[PDB]
Amino acid sequence: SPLAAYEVDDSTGYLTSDVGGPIQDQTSLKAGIRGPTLLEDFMFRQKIQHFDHERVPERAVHARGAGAHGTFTSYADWSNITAASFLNATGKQTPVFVRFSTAAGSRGSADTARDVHGFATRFYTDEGNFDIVGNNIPVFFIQDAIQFPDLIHSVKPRPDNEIPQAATAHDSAWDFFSQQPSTMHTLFWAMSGHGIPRSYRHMDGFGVHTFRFVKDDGSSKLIKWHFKSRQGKASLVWEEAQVLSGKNADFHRQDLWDAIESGNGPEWDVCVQIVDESQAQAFGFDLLDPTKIIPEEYAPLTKLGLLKLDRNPTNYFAETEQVMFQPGHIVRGIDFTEDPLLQGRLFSYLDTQLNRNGGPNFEQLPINMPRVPIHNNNRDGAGQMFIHRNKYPYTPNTLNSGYPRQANQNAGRGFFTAPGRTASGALVREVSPTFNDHWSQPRLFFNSLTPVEQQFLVNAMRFEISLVKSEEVKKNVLTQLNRVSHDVAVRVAAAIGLGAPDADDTYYHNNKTAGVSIVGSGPLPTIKTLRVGILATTSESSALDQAAQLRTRLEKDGLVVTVVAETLREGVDQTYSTADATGFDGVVVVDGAAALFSSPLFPTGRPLQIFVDAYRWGKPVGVCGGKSSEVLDAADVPEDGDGVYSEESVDMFVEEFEKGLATFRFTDRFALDS
Amino acid sequence: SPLAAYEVDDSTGYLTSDVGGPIQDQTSLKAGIRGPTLLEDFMFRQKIQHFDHERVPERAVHARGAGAHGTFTSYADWSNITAASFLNATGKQTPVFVRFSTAAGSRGSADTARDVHGFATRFYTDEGNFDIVGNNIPVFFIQDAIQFPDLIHSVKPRPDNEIPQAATAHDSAWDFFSQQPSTMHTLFWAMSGHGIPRSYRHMDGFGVHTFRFVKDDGSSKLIKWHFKSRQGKASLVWEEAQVLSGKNADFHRQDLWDAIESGNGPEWDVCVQIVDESQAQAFGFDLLDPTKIIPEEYAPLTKLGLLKLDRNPTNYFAETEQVMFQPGHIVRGIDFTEDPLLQGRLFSYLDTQLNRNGGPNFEQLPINMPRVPIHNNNRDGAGQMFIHRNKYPYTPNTLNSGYPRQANQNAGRGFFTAPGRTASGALVREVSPTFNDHWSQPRLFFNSLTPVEQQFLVNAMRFEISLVKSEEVKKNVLTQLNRVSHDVAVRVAAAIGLGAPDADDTYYHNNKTAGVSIVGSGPLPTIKTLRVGILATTSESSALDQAAQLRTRLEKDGLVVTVVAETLREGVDQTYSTADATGFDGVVVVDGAAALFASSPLFPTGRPLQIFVDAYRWGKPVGVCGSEVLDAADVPEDGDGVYSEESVDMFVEEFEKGLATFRFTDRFALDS
Amino acid sequence: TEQVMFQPGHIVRGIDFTEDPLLQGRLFSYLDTQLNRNGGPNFEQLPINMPRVPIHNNNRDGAGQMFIHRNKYPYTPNTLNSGYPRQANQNAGRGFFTAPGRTASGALVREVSPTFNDHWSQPRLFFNSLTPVEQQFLVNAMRFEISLVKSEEVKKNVLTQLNRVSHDVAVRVAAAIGLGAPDADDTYYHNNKTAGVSIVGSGPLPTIKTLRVGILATTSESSALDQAAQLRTRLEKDGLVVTVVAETLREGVDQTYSTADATGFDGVVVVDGAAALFASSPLFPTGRPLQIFVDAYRWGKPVGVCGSEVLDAADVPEDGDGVYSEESVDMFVEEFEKGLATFRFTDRFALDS
Numbered sequence A: 001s002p003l004a005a006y007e008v009d010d011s012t013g014y015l016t017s018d019v020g021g022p023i024q025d026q027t028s029l030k031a032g033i034r035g036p037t038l039l040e041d042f043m044f045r046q047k048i049q050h051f052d053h054e055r056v057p058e059r060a061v062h063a064r065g066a067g068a069h070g071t072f073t074s075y076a077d078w079s080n081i082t083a084a085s086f087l088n089a090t091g092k093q094t095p096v097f098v099r100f101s102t103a104a105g106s107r108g109s110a111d112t113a114r115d116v117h118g119f120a121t122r123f124y125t126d127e128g129n130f131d132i133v134g135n136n137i138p139v140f141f142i143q144d145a146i147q148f149p150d151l152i153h154s155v156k157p158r159p160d161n162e163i164p165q166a167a168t169a170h171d172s173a174w175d176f177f178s179q180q181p182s183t184m185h186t187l188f189w190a191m192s193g194h195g196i197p198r199s200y201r202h203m204d205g206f207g208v209h210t211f212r213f214v215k216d217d218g219s220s221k222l223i224k225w226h227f228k229s230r231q232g233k234a235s236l237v238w239e240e241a242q243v244l245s246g247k248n249a250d251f252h253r254q255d256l257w258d259a260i261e262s263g264n265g266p267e268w269d270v271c272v273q274i275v276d277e278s279q280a281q282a283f284g285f286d287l288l289d290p291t292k293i294i295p296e297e298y299a300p301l302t303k304l305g306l307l308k309l310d311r312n313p314t315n316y317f318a319e320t321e322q323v324m325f326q327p328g329h330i331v332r333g334i335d336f337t338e339d340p341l342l343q344g345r346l347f348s349y350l351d352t353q354l355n356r357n358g359g360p361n362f363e364q365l366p367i368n369m370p371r372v373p374i375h376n377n378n379r380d381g382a383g384q385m386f387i388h389r390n391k392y393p394y395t396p397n398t399l400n401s402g403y404p405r406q407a408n409q410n411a412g413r414g415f416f417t418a419p420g421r422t423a424s425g426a427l428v429r430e431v432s433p434t435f436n437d438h439w440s441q442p443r444l445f446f447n448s449l450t451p452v453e454q455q456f457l458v459n460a461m462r463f464e465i466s467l468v469k470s471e472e473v474k475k476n477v478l479t480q481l482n483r484v485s486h487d488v489a490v491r492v493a494a495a496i497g498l499g500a501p502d503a504d505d506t507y508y509h510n511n512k513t514a515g516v517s518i519v520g521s522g523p524l525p526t527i528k529t530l531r532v533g534i535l536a537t538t539s540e541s542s543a544l545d546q547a548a549q550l551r552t553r554l555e556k557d558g559l560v561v562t563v564v565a566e567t568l569r570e571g572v573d574q575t576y577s578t579a580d581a582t583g584f585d586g587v588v589v590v591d592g593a594a595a596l597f598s599s600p601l602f603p604t605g606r607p608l609q610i611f612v613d614a615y616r617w618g619k620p621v622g623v624c625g626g627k628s629s630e631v632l633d634a635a636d637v638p639e640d641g642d643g644v645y646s647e648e649s650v651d652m653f654v655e656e657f658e659k660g661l662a663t664f665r666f667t668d669r670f671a672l673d674s
Numbered sequence B: 001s002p003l004a005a006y007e008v009d010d011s012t013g014y015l016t017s018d019v020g021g022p023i024q025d026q027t028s029l030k031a032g033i034r035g036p037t038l039l040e041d042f043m044f045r046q047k048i049q050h051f052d053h054e055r056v057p058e059r060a061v062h063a064r065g066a067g068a069h070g071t072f073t074s075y076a077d078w079s080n081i082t083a084a085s086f087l088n089a090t091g092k093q094t095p096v097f098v099r100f101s102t103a104a105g106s107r108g109s110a111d112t113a114r115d116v117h118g119f120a121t122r123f124y125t126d127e128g129n130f131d132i133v134g135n136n137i138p139v140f141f142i143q144d145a146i147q148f149p150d151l152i153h154s155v156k157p158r159p160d161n162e163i164p165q166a167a168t169a170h171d172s173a174w175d176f177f178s179q180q181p182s183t184m185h186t187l188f189w190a191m192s193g194h195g196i197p198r199s200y201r202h203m204d205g206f207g208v209h210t211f212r213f214v215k216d217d218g219s220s221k222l223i224k225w226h227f228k229s230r231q232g233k234a235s236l237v238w239e240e241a242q243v244l245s246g247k248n249a250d251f252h253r254q255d256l257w258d259a260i261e262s263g264n265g266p267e268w269d270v271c272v273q274i275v276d277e278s279q280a281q282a283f284g285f286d287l288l289d290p291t292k293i294i295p296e297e298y299a300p301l302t303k304l305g306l307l308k309l310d311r312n313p314t315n316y317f318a319e320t321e322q323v324m325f326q327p328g329h330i331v332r333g334i335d336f337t338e339d340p341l342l343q344g345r346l347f348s349y350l351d352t353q354l355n356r357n358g359g360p361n362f363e364q365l366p367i368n369m370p371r372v373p374i375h376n377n378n379r380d381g382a383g384q385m386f387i388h389r390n391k392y393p394y395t396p397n398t399l400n401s402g403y404p405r406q407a408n409q410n411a412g413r414g415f416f417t418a419p420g421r422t423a424s425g426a427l428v429r430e431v432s433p434t435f436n437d438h439w440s441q442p443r444l445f446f447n448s449l450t451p452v453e454q455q456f457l458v459n460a461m462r463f464e465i466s467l468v469k470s471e472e473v474k475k476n477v478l479t480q481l482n483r484v485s486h487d488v489a490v491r492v493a494a495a496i497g498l499g500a501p502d503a504d505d506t507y508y509h510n511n512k513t514a515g516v517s518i519v520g521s522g523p524l525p526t527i528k529t530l531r532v533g534i535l536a537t538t539s540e541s542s543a544l545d546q547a548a549q550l551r552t553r554l555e556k557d558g559l560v561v562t563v564v565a566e567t568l569r570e571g572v573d574q575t576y577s578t579a580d581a582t583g584f585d586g587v588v589v590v591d592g593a594a595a596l597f598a599s600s601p602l603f604p605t606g607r608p609l610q611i612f613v614d615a616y617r618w619g620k621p622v623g624v625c626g627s628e629v630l631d632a633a634d635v636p637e638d639g640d641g642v643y644s645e646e647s648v649d650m651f652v653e654e655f656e657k658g659l660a661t662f663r664f665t666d667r668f669a670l671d672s
Numbered sequence C: 001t002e003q004v005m006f007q008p009g010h011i012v013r014g015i016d017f018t019e020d021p022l023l024q025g026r027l028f029s030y031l032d033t034q035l036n037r038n039g040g041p042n043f044e045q046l047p048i049n050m051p052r053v054p055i056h057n058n059n060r061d062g063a064g065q066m067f068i069h070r071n072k073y074p075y076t077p078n079t080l081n082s083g084y085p086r087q088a089n090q091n092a093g094r095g096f097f098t099a100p101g102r103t104a105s106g107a108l109v110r111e112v113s114p115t116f117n118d119h120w121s122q123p124r125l126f127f128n129s130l131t132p133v134e135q136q137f138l139v140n141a142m143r144f145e146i147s148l149v150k151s152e153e154v155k156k157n158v159l160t161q162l163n164r165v166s167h168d169v170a171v172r173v174a175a176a177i178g179l180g181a182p183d184a185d186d187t188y189y190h191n192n193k194t195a196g197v198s199i200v201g202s203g204p205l206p207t208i209k210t211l212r213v214g215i216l217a218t219t220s221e222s223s224a225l226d227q228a229a230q231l232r233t234r235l236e237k238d239g240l241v242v243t244v245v246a247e248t249l250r251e252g253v254d255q256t257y258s259t260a261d262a263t264g265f266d267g268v269v270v271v272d273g274a275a276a277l278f279a280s281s282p283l284f285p286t287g288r289p290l291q292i293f294v295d296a297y298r299w300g301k302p303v304g305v306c307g308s309e310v311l312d313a314a315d316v317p318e319d320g321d322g323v324y325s326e327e328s329v330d331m332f333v334e335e336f337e338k339g340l341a342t343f344r345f346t347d348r349f350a351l352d353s
């Protein structure tokens, strides 16, 4: 355990104050048995003061989130492309901590809000902490860090009433999007299934920005980070995400926790696209522009190593809440580029920790500490935990023999700015005209989605735009969408009873790019951890027998089985009253239970509703035992439908059903615009 | 008042720094058009620093909530029972600010979580700010403030993984409840419809503690505060609340904002039960015990005045997020009691504002300022907004001519402790044996609910307890429930696959008390603000006509009407895609839309029918204006709260009565 | 040093508070004020504030949380962590307990006990217990401070109070500020004394180790530096801190006249080979060597010459108590060391009539 040294055990012993005096904490000291409480009660005041000051400010963005520890392992010695120590040998291992998050919502908002998602990774390297502060979407809304508060104010709740929570579905957000067309690319990503991932484990991570890899000889190359999930890509459908938000606000954090606890820690290949400095404007856009991806067709991925998360935190506040990432945590071998979005982030993440931590010594929190010695002349500040021996903390000095020594390209493995970097020209507050095409790449993205995937996106837009009250804003939205795709503008316009403006083909094209579609990404490469709900009954001892046999067979392949019945007993995990289709990736009814499909024990129609919801949301569904038509007919589920199963044999049922879990969603169950 | 002076108007003008220098804020200053950002870009740094520091710590409890401004009006000169100046004349008006809230969830959690709810009121009186920091439930979980962090740690999410959000449905909470039986009374309230109110306007407010009214002659009486809703009592059903938590986390704050904007600001009668000091132990329990109510049968309510909320905040953060209530905000004519829960609160609320505000001058925030001058020798501290002219801020002084003067019972209308209060005995960390009955009052409360209401409470317990992993915790919970009621313990245990322990009759009894039932409180006294969803279609011009006709008729009665159809157009407010039954108090299908109730790319499969079916299942009044539909929905034509007409005027008379009835509880199954 | 955060609330079993209303309120203040200094609630985790025994409690979170707590059920009463941490009290776990004999009774009052009302008799007790020159120093401190008070009204109010302690004090202080003392008011006068409160009457110092001796010398005489060095050897062996002062630094010289002052020494010795300096240089301000000797004398310190027209130049009587003049190194050291123990020669200070 990485932070063992800082752990506090309270599995034995007597209660003490923070200064080690044994005390009690259950009754206040009073003047008489029915008397007033005394000011001299220090036991009361120390305990309540602590409680009164437990909270710290939530993160200004990405407030809602969850973390875990793991390991990164290098696949090679990468000295040919970078000086980075953590990448300098085959099999070299570095501890990591990753936090995943939504972006807009406060603490306590729902995991399954439609949003961009954070994917922030710390590498505790032998040459310092290196953070990659990424998202699950490869492009960002805006092209200059200075616009960040405008973006965030617009998508956060309206500031008179603080409504709506964790949602872009309101006037101000769509007003900003329509007035600031740079937003289109990330908007199209967020309106796709990427806005509602099935789990943190089923999404990728992106650094977003172009960075540099820098070799010990000072030469550099431009890179993009892509963490490719070994679990596959998967999304919720919108209606499902909505119900989930209410039934289980903690869905993603629970999923991550459970996967780690079961020995199924999630994995990513940590990859880069690498290109030459000379290619900054070779691909049809500017590599300094964070609203653009490099299509995989122009630059393939190099797999650098393996990321695995395999240990849950011990105390969430101490580790997950207090972790303070910074793109300023950089190491020798890596450098920045002149992406004006990146440039401004460097400032913000150092400054914002003062707010969260309330003092300048936030790097001393166990979770933020490096795993190597610290030698500098930083001193004092509130919460100072070190006792510095060096009483001459200035450079240059002779009284401490010139120590600490300066580190740079030539001595002490110092960080150094890529020495080939230059600047030229007037000092300006001007936008590069190379940043000006806001629409071709959103269109490239939309073109790369399958037909049913494009429908889902259009439906997300119809959902949100329909909730915009201002007809002017709605009209301005259609103006921007129409620049990406006339068809999209027409189909969205239809839901809101406006007309799309006439086609404007300046940025239309039919090009496609690999690796961005969820629905087209193939069956999941593993079904371990997926959830199967077996709907059963206590009326029939045969229903519970089938359920037990099924459980045994599914659990063997690492599926997480929940048997549902009217009441709990041995072998039944959940009651119908607490069960919901959003709790499962697949739903099986045992034919012993056919009769269920009114009780004081659950709402009217609940068992059927679970099956029907599962079907409507595209999940694999079936009946096990041999008698199926009663259940399937009651549900209106066709017996020959794709992803609908019926077998007497447990072994045979499970083999078919398991293919359906891998396929994950049966998209033919969703209507398309004609 | 101190608020208008601090309002900032940005509807015209050029962008400036915080020091008034005109600037831009859209592009960073760079060394060349594709170059690095410059450190000398002060426009960038001031803007991003402000953004970086926007957040403040959320409240330690009641982090999720919403506020409004209003007025309190006194009904009489109450000098006969209290010296309090805000109650000293018929018609005397005092501005107020109220914040409502849940209790356990963090600031972005759903309004409709099952919880105790806060109801905190500030009266900006002419003798200082007076706060009554209350809840929608009259009793609290614990009997000593020192246990507050134990309660809160147990109910809040498990601290290794921070799961679950805004919910008592987990092991630790039920472990605490079953180990600390004082919790039983508040537990039964929170497991009732009181844990899931229909709105902030449809719940009452309670001070919880016994306080004193003190007269200018020094005599005192014991009081309980009860804010009685003029809107009536109403709850959601649990399944509804769960769906609402996902479809509209902002449901209660939205409901409050909308009511105020439409000129339907909610009202309460501010009442007290008043009893003599001699009655502290006269009613069969201790009035110092915050887990106990005084039954209305023993002490009727006196109406003191009218509380109305009628103006929304201008900036949520500055007013609602920053309001810092304290029970230590007391005025002459009120005093504390030796309730060990109240006692410790007085410490906590002063201290915790240091955490939220980051400095000691939090009473200077406009929302926290009083409406009368301030004279004291408090000085300096971070964020000091005053420039004090008195250069001799110590007492006693001659250099400032002995000012400010000390105020007390005799001089300057000072606050004074009720002079009859005494203390006697050993200095002890002991619980009074008078506090020891943890079970009789929860039973009193349970007995006072209707059968269906009792069933909802059993079902809420079945739901939560079935989620507790630990078999030993579940057994311990049954032990405690059994001491309140054997029948509750039997019926709860049936769902969780355990046997209830044998009846222990020590605290059983069959007494009832008035005014605690929601289902029993009769029809709503008003239907203004209630929501009607009219389900229509763009496919038939008739359907849209019917909807428009119903709309004009319902709207005249102060009902909020939403016409729902496949796509938006003139006449249509919402699409089926965004519509849910949780958005309505009543649902009407116009028969021209019959066809929708048997696929489209414009909405999920079965959505129109599901809205009607959910609405019915949740006990709402439902109707068809103009057989196909009710049959599709499995809704019996003869059922109460089911309306079938052709005549719009008649439909309206009948449906409006159903909205007052509010819920049709006969649609919910009972235990055998 | 800067971060240590003391509290009278840091108490242990076997000690308890009393109902002293000054102590009572301090208990509140020291806990609260650490929030201001530390900027967060985890100030007891600063290394200087940490205890030297394990900590077991349910305090959690807060800005600057440096622990990682393993108990995931931090509430009492619990079964999920087996009831740990356990309550400590008089009969379990060596808990702190309030003295069980303590009681309270009566009205809840904002009243001062009448037993507190005598504000003047103990001030008089203290004053009575000081030696005559000690009483003079105190009168002179008050003369100094009160003479700086602008308000005539405050000065008169001050004399009123001083007079309730001692009419003589009020008379002598009044003399310096040009007002008349009010008439004697003997309510609280008495002649009683108490042991252990006087500094001057507390006897010679029990040790002279650490005390500072300034040896004023010259670079112009090799004899002067020789004498200095010889004294140094002797004095240093007795634990005294010796500083040889001359016009410029060099081997054996610690401090120039320019940076030297009498406040830097408990005793001052002139090596007679340096008599010339005591009679202008760009190396120190005019008359510096003499001024040091003169200040040391006027402030009551043991002063000496080792090798006596210096004493004339300094107007110091050869026969005065705590004035030394010997050519014998050993004899001088011996006598001068007795002077350092005596510490101050109080006969050098003028007294009121």
Ligand code: HDD
Pocket: A059, A060, A061, A062, A065, A099, A100, A101, A117, A118, A119, A120, A133, A134, A135, A140, A144, A145, A146, A148, A207, A208, A209, A290, A323, A324, A325, A341, A344, A345, A348, A349, A352, A353, B048, B052
């Ligand atoms: C100049 C302001 C600014 C800009 C332009 C961005 N961010 Fe940021 N980000 C912040 C300012 C910020 C912040 C206010 O500084 C936060 C809040 C808490 C923190 O540590 O930094 C933050 C938090 C934060 C987190 C949560 C980290 C955690 O889990 O603790 C993630 C994943 C990101 N951001 C990712 C991004 C990505 C992928 C961006 C576009 C490429 C981006 N941010 C642009």
Ligand code: HDD
Pocket: A048, A052, B059, B060, B061, B062, B065, B099, B100, B101, B117, B118, B119, B120, B133, B134, B135, B140, B144, B145, B146, B148, B206, B207, B208, B209, B290, B323, B324, B325, B341, B344, B345, B348, B349, B352, B353
């Ligand atoms: C000793 C600790 C303690 C105890 C025993 C209680 N509370 Fe409390 N309460 C707090 C400590 C606290 C607090 C930590 O001090 C809060 C958090 C933010 C604040 O201003 O005070 C608070 C917040 C708070 C709020 C939110 C006020 C707002 O909207 O800003 C309400 C309505 C209540 N409480 C009501 C109660 C009631 C009805 C209680 C039982 C009779 C109660 N509290 C017991």
Ligand SMILES: [Ca+2]
Pocket: A158, A170, A171, A172, A173
């Ligand atoms: Ca808005």
Ligand SMILES: [Ca+2]
Pocket: B158, B170, B171, B172, B173
């Ligand atoms: Ca738990």
